[PDB]
Design a protein around this ligand. Structure first.
Ligand SMILES: [Cl-]
Length: 142
């Protein structure tokens, strides 16, 4: 899709799927040492996410960017240690208690990571299978 649609589609999907929060991360630049940052957000409580710097292979977005595998964390407090909590600062800046992170694809590469989150102990609305993934979030792929 055109770059000029990412925000609108992100917001609509967040609301359809019933999440408190959504975001999308990409590499900050084409420089070799580029970090990964959270480029778009929706349902965010503040702007501190703009300070977050993720090194390659680290946090939620780094791991999904690397592995090609979605991550489902039903409960942050139970599923993650404090070392993992630290690699994923969006958890802290947005007070997220559950999350779903999905890779977005371009010619078999992961070019971005799409994150959905809940606050206040609200559960994930549903755990999607591979086909629902593709159907609901395939708009972001080619
Ligand atoms: Cl993060």
């Amino acid at each position: 899709i055109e770059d000029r649609r990412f925000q609108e589609t992100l917001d609509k999907i967040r609301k359809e799927e019933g999440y408190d929060f959504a975001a999308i991360a990409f590499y900050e630049s084409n420089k070799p040492s580029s970090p990964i940052k959270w480029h778009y957000v929706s349902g965010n409580k503040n702007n501190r996410f703009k300070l977050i710097i993720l090194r390659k292979g680290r946090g939620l977005a780094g791991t999904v960017m690397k592995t090609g595998k979605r991550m489902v964390i039903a409960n942050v407090g139970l599923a993650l240690g404090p070392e993992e909590k630290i690699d994923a600062p969006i958890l802290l800046s947005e007070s997220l208690t559950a999350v779903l992170a999905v890779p977005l694809w371009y010619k078999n590469q992961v070019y971005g990571v799409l994150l959905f989150g809940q606050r206040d102990g609200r559960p994930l609305p549903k755990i999607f299978d591979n086909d629902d993934i593709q159907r609901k979030f395939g708009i972001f792929n080619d």
